[PDB]
Amino acid sequence: TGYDLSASTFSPDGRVFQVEYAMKAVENSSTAIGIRCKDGVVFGVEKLVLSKLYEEGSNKRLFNVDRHVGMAVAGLLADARSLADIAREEASNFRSNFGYNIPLKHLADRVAMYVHAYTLYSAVRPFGCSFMLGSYSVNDGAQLYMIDPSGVSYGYWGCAIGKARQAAKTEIEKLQMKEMTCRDIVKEVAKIIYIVHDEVKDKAFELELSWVGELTNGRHEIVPKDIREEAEKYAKESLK
Template sequence: MNKSVITGPGYDTPITSYSPEGRVLQVEYATLAVANSFTIIGMRGKDSVVLAVDKIIMSSLYEPDADGRIVSLERNIGMAMAGLTSDGHAVADIARQEAANFRMNYNRVIPLRDLCERIASYMHAATLNGLNRPFGLSVILASWEASEGPELYKIEPCGSFLGYYACACGRAKPQADQEFDKLENLSGMGTEELVKAAAEIIYKGHYDWQNRDFLFEMGIVGKDTRGLHLINPPVLTEIARAAGAEAAANETSSSDEAFF
C-alpha cells in the first residue's frame, strides 16, 4: 500500500492513533498552533520571575485589558499562555480549582511543581481520549516563595513540563532563545534588570511584525512584590516599556545602516 496514503487523513484525524513513523499528528498540530501564536517569555532572576507577552492589538475598539494572556492562579503563582486563548482560560480555571483544593486540604499555598504536575496531567489526558482534542496551548508558570525562591516551569501541549531559567513560546521563540544565550548571569539579575531584559527581548522579537501595533504586558512575582503575583505593576511596566522601546529603536537604526 502507498505509504503517502497511509500517513494522510487516516492518521491525522484520530488522536489515539500513531502514524507509521510513530507520530501523534494531532499533538503536532497543537504544537504548530502554539508556534504561530503571540510570543510569551519567562525569565527567572535572583529574587523574582518575570512573565512577558507581546499582545497584538487586533482592534482599536477593544478595551485595554481585553484578551489578556497573563493570569494569576494563586496569590504567588502566575501563568502566561501561548496558543488558543480560550484553551488557556479553560486550563487556568482547572489550575485555580486545583490550587483551591490544595489550600482547603493543607491550609497553605500549593507548591508550583505540584500544580505543574496536575496541569500537565490534565493536558496529557486530552491526548489520550478520542472524544477530545489536544489543547492548542503551551503555558509558562512562575512563582516565588521565601522557602523555595523563584521558580519557572513550561508545559507543552503533549503534557510534558520542565523547569527553566528562561524559556519562550510563540512565533519569536527562536529569536528569544538567541537573546537568552547572550545574557550573562541571568540567575543573578535583580528585579529591575530582569524586567528590562524581558522587555528588550519582546520588543526585538516583535521587530519583524512591527507593521502591527502591540502592547507589552508583564507579570512579576518575587521578593520585591512581597510574594504576590502582580500583572502590569505601573512603575515596573513603564520601566520595561521604555527599555523595550529603546532596544527596538536601536535595532531599527542598526538595520537601516548602509552597506559598503
C-alpha cells in the same frame, strides 16, 4: 488520514500528528516569554491589536492561577482561559486539602498530567495552548515551569513560546538570568520582546508584563504602571 485524525492513534511510525498540529497552533500565535531570576519570575506577553477600539489589558494572556502562581499563555486563548480555571481549581483543592499554598512543582506536574490526560482519547482533542507558570516561595525561591500542549512540564531558567521563541531565547542567552535582579530583568524582557516582535508582520502591538517574587511578598502581581513606562522607555532606547 487515520494517523492524524485523533489523539488516540499512532502514526505507522508511532507519532501524534494531532499533538503536532496543536504545537503548530501554539507556535503561530503571538510571542510570550518568561524569565526566572534569583529574586523573581517575570512574564512578558505580546498582544496583537486587532483594532485600536480594544482596551489595554483586554484578552490577557497572563492569568493569576494561585495567590503566588502566574500563568503566561500562548495558543488558543479560550483554551488558555479554561486551563487557567483548571489550574486555579487544582490550587484551591490543594489549599483545602493541605492548609497551605500549593508548590509550583506539584502544581505544574498535576496540570501537565491533566493536559496529557486530554491527549489520550478520541473523545477529546489535545489543548491548543502552551503555558509557563512562575511562582515564589521563601524556602524554594523563584520557580518557573513551562508546559507544552502535549503535557510535558520542565523547569526553565528562561523560556519563550510562540513565533520568535527561538530568537528570544538565543539573544537573551547573553543574560546570566539565574542570578539576576528582577527589576532590571523586567527592562531586559521589554528589550528582548521588542526586538523579537516583528513590526512589519504585526504593525499594531501591545505588551502585558508581570512578575512574582520576593519583592512581591510572594504573591503574583502585575507590573506597576510607573515601572511599565520606564521599561517601555528602556525598550524604545534599546530598539536604537
